[PDB]
Amino acid sequence: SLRLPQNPNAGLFKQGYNSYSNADGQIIKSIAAIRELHQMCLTSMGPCGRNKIIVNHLGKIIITNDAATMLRELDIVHPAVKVLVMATEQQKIDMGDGTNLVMILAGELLNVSEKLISMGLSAVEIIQGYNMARKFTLKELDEMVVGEITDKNDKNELLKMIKPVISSKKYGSEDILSELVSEAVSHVLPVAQQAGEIPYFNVDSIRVVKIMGGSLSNSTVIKGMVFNREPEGHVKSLSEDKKHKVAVFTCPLDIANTETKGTVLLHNAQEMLDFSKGEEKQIDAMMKEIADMGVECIVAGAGVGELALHYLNRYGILVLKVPSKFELRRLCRVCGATPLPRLGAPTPEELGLVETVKTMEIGGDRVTVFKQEQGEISRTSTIILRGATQNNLDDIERAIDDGVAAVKGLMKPSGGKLLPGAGATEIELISRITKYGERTPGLLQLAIKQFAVAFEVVPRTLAETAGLDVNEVLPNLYAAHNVTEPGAVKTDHLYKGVDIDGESDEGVKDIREENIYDMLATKKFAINVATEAATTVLSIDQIIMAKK
Amino acid sequence: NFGSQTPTIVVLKEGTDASQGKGQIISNINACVAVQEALKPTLGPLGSDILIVTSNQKTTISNDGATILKLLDVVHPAAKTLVDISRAQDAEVGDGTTSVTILAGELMKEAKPFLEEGISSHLIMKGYRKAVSLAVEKINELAVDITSEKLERCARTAMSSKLIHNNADFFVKMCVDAVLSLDRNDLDDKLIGIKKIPGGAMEESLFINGVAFKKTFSYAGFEQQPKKFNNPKILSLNVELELKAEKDNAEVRVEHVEDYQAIVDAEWQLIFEKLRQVEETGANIVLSKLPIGDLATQFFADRNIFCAGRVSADDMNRVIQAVGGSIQSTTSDIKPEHLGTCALFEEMQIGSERYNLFQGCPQAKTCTLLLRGGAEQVIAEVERSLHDAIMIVKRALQNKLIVAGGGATEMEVSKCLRDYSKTIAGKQQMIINAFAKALEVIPRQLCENAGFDAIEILNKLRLAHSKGEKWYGVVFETENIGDNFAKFVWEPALVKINALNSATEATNLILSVDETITNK
Amino acid sequence: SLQLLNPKAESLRRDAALKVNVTSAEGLQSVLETNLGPKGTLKMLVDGAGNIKLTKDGKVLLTEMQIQSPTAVLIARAAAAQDEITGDGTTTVVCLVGELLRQAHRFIQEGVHPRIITDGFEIARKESMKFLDEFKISKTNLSNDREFLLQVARSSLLTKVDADLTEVLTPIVTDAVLSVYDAQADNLDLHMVEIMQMQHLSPKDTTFIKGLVLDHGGRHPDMPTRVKNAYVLILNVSLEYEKTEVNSGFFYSSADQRDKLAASERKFVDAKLKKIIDLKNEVCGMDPDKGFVIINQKGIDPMSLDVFAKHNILALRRAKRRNMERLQLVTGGEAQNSVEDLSPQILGFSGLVYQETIGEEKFTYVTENTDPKSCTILIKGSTHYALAQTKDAVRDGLRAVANVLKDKNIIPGAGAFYIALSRYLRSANMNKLGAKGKTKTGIEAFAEALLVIPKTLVKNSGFDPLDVLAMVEDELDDAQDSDETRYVGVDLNIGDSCDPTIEGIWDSYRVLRNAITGATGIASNLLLCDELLRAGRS
Ligand SMILES: Nc1ncnc2c1ncn2[C@@H]1O[C@H](COP(=O)(O)OP(=O)(O)O)[C@@H](O)[C@H]1O
Ligand SMILES: Nc1ncnc2c1ncn2[C@@H]1O[C@H](COP(=O)(O)OP(=O)(O)O)[C@@H](O)[C@H]1O
Ligand SMILES: Nc1ncnc2c1ncn2[C@@H]1O[C@H](COP(=O)(O)OP(=O)(O)O)[C@@H](O)[C@H]1O
Ligand SMILES: [Mg+2]
Ligand SMILES: [Mg+2]
Ligand SMILES: [Mg+2]
C-alpha cells in the first residue's frame, strides 16, 4: 500500500532500457514530438521563410532556412524524428531540392494520421491507403505537366529555372543573384550542338569561394578559379600576350629522395667537393628541359625546396601550392592538362593553356586568379561571392549548391518537365485525389481523403508566412478550381496560386508572366521519401530505447 | 513496459535554450543595442576611447569598431553580426568601422516597435533593401567627378577620433608620400610594414625611403664592421653561412687516418669557397633568413663587410623591393647586375635597439617609419591610426570620389527618401521614413559628444537644405553650421556605400530570424 | 500519459498489473497455505521487541506482519472480515482467491475477457448455494448430547495443537456452552466467558471451573480466604475519592479544627459504610460459616480496609467493565452503584469461594453456583506464547461449537463439500448459462479452483494428491449408481478416502458461506482490475 512492487520481472533487461508500445497514447506523443520541430519548419518554407540560429557546443554557428541543413547539428533523442532527419538528408544528397517539403508533408501526414488512429483505423490499412494514393499521385504529376526547356544553353530559359529555386533561400534581389548562376552554368557545360553526344555535368564543377568585404552587387563571375595563396619568388602582372603554357606536377619540386634511409656517404675529400655542386648542377639540368618548353607557371602538389625555387624564379616561372588531392585535380580540368609525377619534360600535348595570371587585392589578402578568355573555353568555373557577414556567405553558398543541384535535374531525364508553382501543383492534387477517393470503395476512402487534406499545408504555410489571414486567402483560391473544366478548350485556371505580396484576394496573376515553376524530378522523390517517412513511423507500434 | 517509470521522451537534449514566444527577436535587438551602446560615444573627433583588459592581462587602448569587438570574445550569436561587418569593413576600407555599427543598431532599434506591431519580417527588409538601392545611387550623385587640382585633405579626416588628429600637420605631410612610392595596380600592403619601438617621443619621428629592421642577435664580430658606407651595395642571400651539415644528413665514413685530416680541411675549404664567392662580387651588406654563424661574420668583419641575419620572410620581401635587387640562394650564380644600391648607410641608436637604415634610393617601392612613443599603446594607436589613414589615401588613388563629411551625406540622402516615401504606395511610407530618421544617427551622436544641444542642430539642418544643396554639414570650430566646401573637409564615398550595404545586410540577416537554438 | 500529470507517479497497465495481482496472490498462497490442516507447521512471529508467539491462524499472522503489496492487503482485509464475523476459515479464503486467480489467469492468457469469467463465478456461486442448501443436514440440538459436541470441537482444535493437548482441551470447549442457552429468544453470548492469562503447572494441566474467577486478591491478611457461603454485593462508586469536581479547600481558623476537618472526611466514609455493616447483620447475626464478599469496580480506600478486615469482609477492586454482567449471571445477584437502598433479595449466592497465592499475585476463585448462566476458562501455560496459542485456539474453537446452536444445520468437513461441489459445477445443461460459449469458461474455472483445499491437506501430510483423489473419484462414480447417499473425505494418516460422518470431522455452515462469498467477490474485483496507480503529496 505504501509502495508498489515497481514492475516485477524487470530484471530481464537492464534498468536503463525502456519500452514504448502503441497504447497509452504514445503514438500520439510521437506525433506531438514531430509537432515540436515541425512548427519550426512552418516559419521556414517559402520566400518569406525565416532563418534559424543554431549554436553548437563548439560555437560554430550556421544561420539557415533549409531543413536538411539545420537538422544535421541538432542532437535528437526521439528516434521517429531522426527518420525525418535522414529522410531530408537523402533529399539533399540525391536531388538537392525540396527538403522543407519532405519535412512539412511527412509531418502533416502524421498529423492527419492522429485523427485516423483515433477514429479506429488499423495501422495496416493506413499504409495501404497512402500507397494507393502515392501511385495515383505520381501518375497525375506526369499528366498535368506543361512546358519544357528543350535547350541546354539560353539566357532567358535559365531565368525560369534558377530564380524559383534560389527565391526560397536568401531571396534578396532577383536579377543580381540569378545572373551569377546562369553565366557560370553556360561556361562549364559541354554544349556541342548537332553532334549526338551525351551531355555531362558535375556538381563539383561550380564552387564558390567566400571572401569577406564588399557588397552583393560587386560580385563577379570568374572563368577560372582562385585561392588565397602568395607567390614565393616574385609577383608578375604578366602583360605579355601570346599565351603561356601550364605544367602540373603532383610530386614536390625537389630531388626524389630515397624512400629507405636516404643518407649521405662521402669516403674522401674529392666527393666532399663535388657533392655540394652536384646537387646544384643536377637540379639546374632538370629545369633546362622544363624551361625550354616555354612554360612560365608550375603548380606544385607538396612542399617545394629552396634550391629548386632558385632556378624556377630565375626564368620567371610562377609557383603555386596545392597541398591536397582534390585542390590539385580541380585545376587540371580548367586548362585540360594531364599531370605526370616525373620531373622530366612535360609532353606538349599535355601542357595546359592559360593566358593570364593576375594578383590583386579583393579581401585584403593575396589571391591568385586564372581568368580565361572567350577563346579556348574551360570548365569548373568559380563565382566570387562578396558579402559583409560570414554567416550570410554560408547560406548563399549552399543556395548555389541547390541551384547547381537543380541543373543536374535536366541531364538524366528526357527534359525539363516544369510544373506550376506557388501552391498550384499542390491544390490541383487535392481535387484529383479527392475524386479518386470517390471512385474506390472500401474503408480505405478515409485514408485517401486525409491524404488530400495533408496537401493543404503548402498554401496554408505561404499564406501564414506572408502576413495574410489564411481563413480568407485559402477558400478564395478554391473558387478557381470549383469552376471545373467547361466545354471550352485551353483553360487557364491551373496557373492560379498564392501570392506573397500584392493584390488582395491572393490568387496570383498566374505563376506565368511571373516565371516561377517547379521541377518534376523533385516532386517525384519528395512525395516518395515523405510517404516512406510516414510509413516507417506509422507501421511501427512498439519502440524500445536505452539509457534515457 | 520494461520499467515502472516510463520516462516521457523529450524532443531536444537537456539544457537546450527556450523557443518561440514573445521577446525572442527583441532580445537579439536589445543584445545588439547593448553592444551598440559601448561603441556609441566613440564617434567623431570629440568622442572618447575604450579601455579593455582581457583574461591574459593584456592592456589595450583603442576606439576602432573592429579592434574593440576583436578582443571582446562575444558569445551571443546575434551580436557577432556586428563583429563580422566590422572586420569586413576593416579588411577592405579600414575606416568608418564604427559608423557602420552605430547605424545598423539604429535600424534594428527602429525595427523594434514595428515587430511589436503586426508588421511581418519580410515587409521591413523589403523597405531597407529597396531604399538602400536609391541611397547608393544618391551617393553617386552626391559624390563628385573631381580631376582638377591634382590625398592631403583625405588623410586629415581619416586620422580623426584618435591620437594623431591634432598632430595632422606633421603626419599627413609624410603619410601622403607613403602611397606615392607605390605604383598603380600593385598596392602591396606588406611594403608599408611598420614595427614597434617602446621608448621615445612621437614628435621626433622622420620619413625613411627604405627599411629599418632589428638585428635580434649580437654577433662576435659585429662591432668590428664599419657603420658608415658611402656607396653600399646590397645582396640578399638564403644559404646558411656556418659550419654544419650540408643537406639534411650527417654520415661520413673514413678508413685511412691520412684522409681524415683532408676531409676536415675540405669542409674548411668549401665554407671559405662559399664565403669567397660572396666576397669577390663586392657585396658590402649581407642578409639571410637563416642564421649566420660566428665563422662567417668574423670573415666578413676583417675586410669591412657588414652582415646580419635572423629576419623574417616578410621583412626580406620588403628589402628586395626597396633596393630593387633579387633573391639568390646560391653563391655560385651571383652576378654584379643583381646587386641593389642606395645613397648611404648609417646604424643609429633608436630606443636601446639597433636598426639598419637604408635611404636615398632613386626609385624606392617601400615606406617604413619607426613608431616611437611612451607607452606600448601609444605606438599601437599611432600604428592603427596610420593604417586606417593609409588605406583611405591608397584607395583615393584608385578612384577620385569625394563626398561631404560631418554627417552631411546622411541628411541629403534622408531628404530624398522622405520625398520618395511621400509619393507612392502608402504602406511602406512609415518604413522608409523610419529608415530616413534612423539614418540620421551619425550627425545625431556627433553633436552630442560635442556638448551642443541636438534640437537646435537638427532643426537647422532640415530647413536649410535648399541653399545647402549638397555640401551642408556640421562645423565644430566656430560652434555654428555652414558649408563644408570652404572648410576643406573631404571624405571618400566608398566608406558610405560599404557602410549602408553592410548595415543593411546586418539588420536584414537577423530580421529574417525568429529562433535561437543553443546545444549544451 | 500519467507522467505528464505527475512526474513522480507510476502505472502498470493491462499486462504488468495482472502479473502483480496473480503473483502476489500466489506468493501469499505459497507462504500461508502450509498452516491448513492438522499436519500444518507452526510460525514464530518474532517482532523487533523480541516477542515470541506461536499460531496457525492467518488473521494474526497478517495482522502483526504489515503487508507491502497492494493486492495482498485486499486479501488480508478479507481474512479480517472472515475472522471478525466467523472466527474460522481464513486459510481457505486466501487459498481460494489464490487458486481462482490462478485458474482464471490460465484462461485470460488464452484470450478470454475477464467479464464473462467473473460472470461464470457468480453463476457458479449461486449454483453452489442451491447445492449447499440441499447438501446440509438438520439435527436436533434439544437433547444437548455431549458426544456430538466433543467430536465437532475435536475437529476444530486438532488444527491448532497436537493430539494429546487436544484431548485435554476439547472437554473445556464443550463445557463453555453448558448453561448459556435460550430456546425462545435465541440469544447466545460469546463474550461472557473470561480468558485469564497466568503461568502455572503446564498447558496440559488446565481444567474447567463452573463459576467466575477474578484476578484480584485480598489486600489485608486478616480477612478469610475460605468462605463457605458468600453473598455478593456489587459496587461501582469509588469508596476512595479521587478528586472533588468543584474546587474547594479547608481553611481552618485554629489548630483545634484540623483534626475535626480530618474527621469530616471520616464521616462520609462511615456514612456509606454503615449501611454495609447494617446489611451484614440484617440477614442473621452470629452465623458461622457464612461470609460476605464485595466486588467493586473502582478503587477502595486503604484506610477503609481495616473496617472490612475487622468484620471479615472480602473486598476486591479495579474490576473489569464486562465482568459486571458476568457476576449476576454466575452468582444470580443484582448490580448496584450506590448504597441508598439495600436488601437481601438483591444479593446473590455462592457455594464456595477461595483464593490461591501464585507468585507475587493472588487469584480469587468463585465456584459452586446453583444455576449459573456463565462460566470461565483458565488458560494455564508454561510460557508466554502458549497462552496466546491456547487463547487463539479457544477463541477459534468457541465459534465452531457456538454456530451449531445458532443454526442447527452443519456441513461435513474433510473436503467433502469441495469434492462434491466439483462434479455439480461441471455441466450446467440449460439451468443458468446466459450466453453461448461465454459463461461456461468461468464454470470450468470455478469448478477446478475449489479442489485445491483437499489437495493442500495432502501436501502437508506428505502423500501424493492425485493418487489419493483417484480412489475418491472412483468411489463416487459407483456411489451414484449404488443408490446410497455417501459422503467421502480425506484421511491424512494412511492416505485413503474416508467418511466424515463416521469419523467425526465437521465444518460450520457460516464458514463456507462467507468464505466462498468473500473469495468470489475479491477474486472477481481483482480480475476486473486492469491498472494500478499511486499518487499523493509527500
Ligand atoms: N515569389 C513567389 N511567388 C509565389 N510562390 C513562390 C515564390 N517563391 C517561391 N514560391 C513557392 O514556394 C515554394 C517553396 O519551395 P521550397 O521547398 O522552399 O524550395 P527549396 O527546396 O529550394 O527550399 C516553391 O515550391 C514555390 O512554388
Ligand atoms: N574634420 C572633421 N570635421 C567634421 N566631421 C568629421 C571630421 N573628421 C571626421 N568627421 C566625421 O567623423 C565621422 C567618423 O569618422 P572617423 O572618426 O574617421 O571614423 P569612426 O567612424 O571610426 O569614428 C565621419 O562620419 C565624419 O563625418
Ligand atoms: N482432522 C481433519 N481431517 C481432515 N480434514 C480436516 C481436519 N481438520 C480440519 N480439516 C479441514 O481443514 C479445513 C479448515 O479447518 P481449520 O484448519 O480448522 O480452519 P483454518 O484453516 O481457518 O485454521 C476444513 O475445511 C476441514 O475440511
Ligand atoms: Mg527550391
Ligand atoms: Mg575613423
Ligand atoms: Mg479452524
XYZ file of C-alpha atoms in Angstrom, chain A residues 21-358:
338
model
C 4.119 0.479 -27.040
C 1.347 1.949 -29.201
C -1.033 2.091 -26.220
C -1.124 4.832 -23.556
C -1.340 7.461 -26.317
C 2.376 7.130 -27.071
C 1.854 7.186 -30.844
C 0.028 10.475 -30.216
C 3.092 11.649 -28.274
C 5.381 10.696 -31.168
C 3.125 12.789 -33.406
C 3.422 15.563 -30.812
C 7.205 15.110 -30.759
C 7.175 15.642 -34.527
C 4.916 18.661 -33.934
C 7.605 20.367 -31.821
C 10.179 20.709 -34.628
C 7.575 20.669 -37.421
C 6.286 24.077 -36.304
C 9.880 25.311 -36.565
C 9.698 24.320 -40.250
C 6.471 26.319 -40.746
C 8.294 29.531 -40.466
C 10.947 28.377 -42.837
C 9.278 27.491 -46.045
C 8.761 29.765 -48.808
C 10.345 33.030 -49.903
C 9.228 34.774 -46.685
C 10.748 31.996 -44.565
C 12.873 32.930 -41.567
C 16.347 31.530 -40.936
C 17.412 29.811 -37.704
C 20.290 30.276 -35.262
C 21.977 27.002 -34.242
C 24.814 27.398 -31.715
C 26.798 24.161 -31.468
C 28.840 23.081 -28.436
C 31.992 24.133 -30.329
C 30.451 27.555 -31.092
C 30.326 27.223 -34.893
C 27.083 28.947 -35.949
C 25.203 28.374 -39.210
C 22.104 30.593 -39.973
C 19.691 28.905 -42.312
C 16.356 28.317 -43.965
C 16.870 24.804 -45.083
C 15.704 21.781 -43.318
C 18.205 19.202 -44.278
C 20.990 21.566 -43.172
C 19.575 22.636 -39.794
C 18.797 19.066 -38.670
C 22.433 17.923 -39.004
C 23.662 19.822 -35.935
C 20.721 19.227 -33.575
C 21.214 16.126 -31.430
C 17.825 14.372 -31.334
C 16.538 11.930 -28.701
C 13.292 10.763 -30.319
C 14.004 8.091 -32.995
C 10.866 8.910 -35.020
C 12.146 12.470 -35.505
C 15.504 11.106 -36.730
C 13.619 9.423 -39.598
C 12.819 12.929 -40.847
C 16.475 13.952 -40.446
C 17.769 11.082 -42.586
C 14.822 11.445 -44.980
C 15.747 15.084 -45.608
C 19.426 14.095 -45.747
C 18.550 11.676 -48.553
C 16.701 14.514 -50.301
C 19.741 16.803 -50.150
C 22.224 14.188 -51.384
C 20.259 12.846 -54.361
C 18.334 15.822 -55.806
C 19.411 18.753 -53.630
C 15.964 20.360 -53.813
C 12.697 20.181 -51.892
C 13.754 19.408 -48.358
C 11.279 21.504 -46.477
C 8.612 19.685 -48.406
C 9.902 16.372 -47.184
C 9.588 17.743 -43.688
C 6.307 19.659 -43.926
C 4.417 16.964 -45.880
C 5.537 13.911 -43.885
C 4.855 15.771 -40.634
C 1.319 16.613 -41.749
C 0.677 13.025 -42.862
C 1.402 12.103 -39.242
C -0.847 14.992 -38.158
C -3.875 13.797 -40.143
C -2.999 10.234 -39.087
C -3.578 11.392 -35.496
C -7.253 11.719 -36.452
C -7.313 8.382 -38.300
C -5.796 6.292 -35.494
C -8.122 7.989 -33.000
C -11.128 7.018 -35.146
C -10.114 3.327 -35.052
C -8.370 2.604 -38.362
C -5.859 -0.232 -38.226
C -2.245 0.628 -38.997
C -2.059 -1.932 -41.824
C -4.878 -0.214 -43.729
C -3.233 3.200 -43.253
C -0.118 2.106 -45.159
C -2.267 0.603 -47.920
C -4.192 3.875 -48.169
C -1.184 6.134 -48.721
C 0.484 3.645 -51.081
C -2.612 3.576 -53.297
C -2.681 7.379 -53.026
C 1.025 7.523 -53.910
C 0.563 5.520 -57.126
C -2.207 7.917 -58.179
C -0.231 10.977 -57.040
C 2.881 10.131 -59.070
C 0.682 9.213 -62.054
C -1.101 12.580 -62.167
C 2.122 14.600 -61.814
C 3.091 13.382 -65.297
C -0.371 14.220 -66.696
C -0.740 17.869 -65.600
C 2.796 18.866 -66.702
C 3.133 21.872 -69.032
C 6.187 23.366 -70.718
C 9.700 22.175 -71.451
C 13.185 23.630 -71.793
C 14.468 21.837 -74.945
C 17.739 23.848 -74.963
C 20.723 23.345 -72.669
C 22.036 26.932 -73.024
C 19.843 30.033 -73.227
C 19.793 33.380 -71.445
C 16.024 33.587 -70.881
C 15.317 29.913 -70.118
C 17.743 29.731 -67.175
C 15.886 32.624 -65.520
C 12.856 30.309 -65.304
C 14.989 27.557 -63.691
C 17.367 29.172 -61.196
C 15.143 32.056 -59.997
C 12.309 29.969 -58.430
C 14.932 27.764 -56.726
C 17.026 30.464 -55.010
C 13.877 32.505 -54.236
C 13.369 30.396 -51.092
C 16.937 30.651 -49.729
C 18.020 34.311 -49.430
C 15.628 35.944 -51.889
C 17.056 39.470 -51.738
C 17.157 40.870 -55.262
C 16.317 38.525 -58.122
C 18.493 39.671 -61.028
C 21.888 40.105 -59.313
C 21.769 36.582 -57.817
C 20.316 34.758 -60.839
C 22.781 36.174 -63.383
C 25.772 34.847 -61.417
C 24.498 31.263 -61.814
C 23.189 31.417 -65.394
C 26.515 32.874 -66.567
C 28.526 30.182 -64.755
C 26.340 27.294 -65.974
C 27.000 28.216 -69.617
C 30.781 28.170 -69.075
C 31.061 24.625 -67.694
C 28.518 22.840 -69.908
C 29.862 20.940 -72.956
C 27.374 22.449 -75.447
C 28.439 20.578 -78.637
C 25.213 21.095 -80.583
C 24.493 18.922 -83.636
C 26.860 16.101 -82.602
C 24.690 13.489 -80.860
C 26.951 13.260 -77.799
C 25.629 12.510 -74.318
C 25.522 15.612 -72.054
C 27.523 15.592 -68.827
C 27.526 17.835 -65.759
C 29.221 17.630 -62.349
C 28.028 19.188 -59.098
C 31.658 19.706 -58.018
C 32.436 21.844 -61.102
C 30.833 25.084 -59.868
C 32.323 26.041 -56.485
C 32.009 29.296 -54.531
C 34.971 30.830 -52.679
C 33.937 33.006 -49.729
C 35.652 36.414 -49.474
C 34.657 38.957 -46.837
C 34.002 42.615 -47.596
C 32.294 44.392 -50.440
C 28.616 44.088 -51.312
C 26.372 41.646 -53.153
C 26.216 43.908 -56.230
C 30.019 43.807 -56.679
C 30.024 40.012 -57.179
C 31.551 38.870 -60.484
C 31.702 35.578 -62.395
C 35.258 34.267 -62.806
C 36.081 31.975 -65.721
C 38.817 30.104 -63.833
C 39.352 29.631 -60.099
C 41.002 31.319 -57.111
C 42.961 30.532 -53.945
C 44.357 32.670 -51.104
C 47.987 31.938 -51.995
C 51.176 34.014 -52.121
C 53.832 33.626 -54.860
C 57.188 32.819 -53.300
C 59.801 34.275 -55.639
C 58.166 37.253 -57.348
C 54.774 38.565 -58.460
C 54.011 39.269 -62.118
C 51.088 41.024 -63.769
C 52.006 39.132 -66.985
C 51.168 41.808 -69.553
C 52.800 39.606 -72.243
C 50.233 38.152 -74.715
C 50.920 35.072 -76.909
C 49.561 32.716 -74.247
C 51.738 30.972 -71.671
C 51.912 27.226 -71.041
C 50.994 25.233 -67.921
C 52.687 22.138 -66.463
C 51.173 20.291 -63.483
C 53.281 18.031 -61.242
C 51.763 16.067 -58.358
C 55.152 15.302 -56.704
C 57.168 18.010 -54.889
C 59.565 20.089 -56.975
C 62.681 18.673 -55.313
C 65.202 15.849 -55.607
C 63.409 12.500 -55.419
C 64.866 11.227 -52.157
C 65.224 7.516 -51.500
C 62.289 6.135 -49.528
C 64.566 3.844 -47.431
C 67.246 5.638 -45.377
C 68.453 8.423 -47.631
C 71.793 9.370 -46.065
C 74.959 10.935 -47.458
C 78.173 8.921 -47.807
C 81.499 10.637 -48.592
C 84.623 8.475 -48.388
C 87.198 11.123 -49.403
C 87.592 14.853 -49.988
C 87.061 14.505 -53.757
C 83.418 13.565 -53.137
C 83.067 16.292 -50.488
C 83.994 18.990 -53.018
C 81.668 17.731 -55.780
C 78.682 16.772 -53.596
C 77.752 20.409 -52.930
C 77.998 21.412 -56.606
C 76.454 18.151 -57.833
C 73.085 18.981 -56.282
C 73.126 22.436 -57.891
C 74.024 21.149 -61.362
C 71.558 18.255 -61.086
C 68.623 20.494 -60.137
C 69.632 23.010 -62.818
C 69.850 20.315 -65.507
C 66.291 19.145 -64.796
C 64.997 22.721 -65.139
C 66.600 23.094 -68.592
C 64.301 20.507 -70.187
C 61.331 22.090 -68.380
C 62.306 25.681 -69.222
C 62.944 25.078 -72.944
C 59.291 24.054 -73.482
C 58.168 27.651 -72.824
C 56.374 27.068 -69.501
C 56.015 30.030 -67.119
C 53.968 28.605 -64.214
C 54.084 25.234 -62.427
C 51.508 24.062 -59.872
C 53.197 22.045 -57.113
C 51.469 19.333 -55.098
C 53.536 19.465 -51.891
C 56.395 21.416 -50.327
C 58.992 22.777 -52.761
C 62.658 23.056 -51.858
C 64.610 26.298 -51.882
C 67.252 25.170 -54.396
C 64.544 24.177 -56.881
C 62.840 27.529 -56.250
C 66.038 29.452 -57.062
C 66.128 28.106 -60.638
C 62.360 28.452 -61.192
C 62.171 32.201 -60.487
C 65.388 32.700 -62.495
C 63.402 32.231 -65.724
C 60.272 33.760 -64.153
C 58.319 30.534 -63.540
C 55.432 31.023 -61.117
C 54.972 28.548 -58.242
C 51.571 27.581 -56.798
C 50.862 25.459 -53.702
C 48.012 22.929 -53.689
C 48.718 20.688 -50.679
C 45.744 18.321 -51.071
C 44.428 15.857 -53.706
C 41.133 17.483 -54.716
C 42.587 21.003 -54.914
C 45.115 19.717 -57.480
C 42.560 17.751 -59.527
C 40.104 20.650 -59.917
C 42.792 22.840 -61.530
C 43.646 20.327 -64.270
C 40.049 20.436 -65.547
C 40.343 24.179 -66.264
C 43.411 24.101 -68.521
C 42.881 20.458 -69.533
C 46.348 19.216 -68.532
C 47.418 15.636 -67.793
C 49.803 15.534 -64.774
C 52.803 13.193 -64.621
C 54.765 12.654 -61.356
C 58.129 12.567 -63.161
C 60.448 15.590 -63.045
C 61.245 15.335 -66.776
C 59.950 17.191 -69.808
C 56.174 17.784 -69.901
C 54.648 16.476 -73.098
C 53.491 19.289 -75.457
C 50.025 17.747 -75.877
C 49.616 17.603 -72.075
C 50.614 21.240 -71.447
C 47.716 23.463 -70.421
C 46.660 26.837 -71.826
C 46.227 29.855 -69.524
C 46.563 33.383 -70.898
C 46.995 35.495 -67.735
C 47.539 35.005 -64.001
C 46.765 38.182 -62.034
